[PDB]
Amino acid sequence: MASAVGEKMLDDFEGVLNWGSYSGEGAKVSTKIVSGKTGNGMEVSYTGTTDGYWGTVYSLPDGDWSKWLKISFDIKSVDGSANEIRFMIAEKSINGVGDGEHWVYSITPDSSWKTIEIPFSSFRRRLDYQPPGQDMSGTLDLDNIDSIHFMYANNKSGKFVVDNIKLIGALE
Ligand SMILES: [Ca+2]
Ligand SMILES: [Ca+2]
């Protein structure tokens, strides 16, 4: 139901596809529109390897979501299994150049379209690698978000698919 509960839309694909793709070392990416949980969805196909890299990216219309508690998507593994991800979010630079801090998940879907509400208290840093104009607040700042990033935690050739990408408020 609209305008009655504490959720706000990030992307439900009813426009033009703004998302990134890239690869190397024998892996591949293909992003395309499909049918989803309301109107259209998005599917993403891959080849995967072990020592390579394969990726898809989004830049947000809002990055100032301190009052919100969770992300949500309705998502499945359409590779032939149920495969996991180590996916990433960037904080804004305190020098106004590059990025400010890097923060990540470890999570898995299944083979069917479940809603996956994940809170801000899920995360840890990207621990090899951080910016020169950095934040050191000891935490992720939802006040201060720049961009979001796919990262590999499986080596499959296969697919994944979504609709309904949102922010969710508290449960009080
Ligand atoms: Ca949709
Ligand atoms: Ca921070």
CATH code, domain with 111: 2.60.120.430
Q: Do residues 60 and 45 lie in contact, with contact meaning Cβ atoms separated by under 8 Å? A: no
Q: Which two tokens stand for residue 79?
A: 């590779």
The rounded Å distance from CA 163 to ligand 1 centre is: 5
Q: Do residues 55 and 21 lie in contact, with contact meaning Cβ atoms separated by under 8 Å? A: yes
Domain hosting 7: range is 1-171
Ligand that lies nearest to the alpha carbon of residue 91, given by its number in the listed order: 2
Those residues whose beta carbon sits under 5 angstroms from the ion ligand 1 are 12-13, 36, 38-39, 163
What technique determined this structure?
Answer: NMR
Number of domains in the chain: 1
Going by C-alpha positions, the residue among 75, 127, 131, 137 that lies closest to residue 104 is: 127
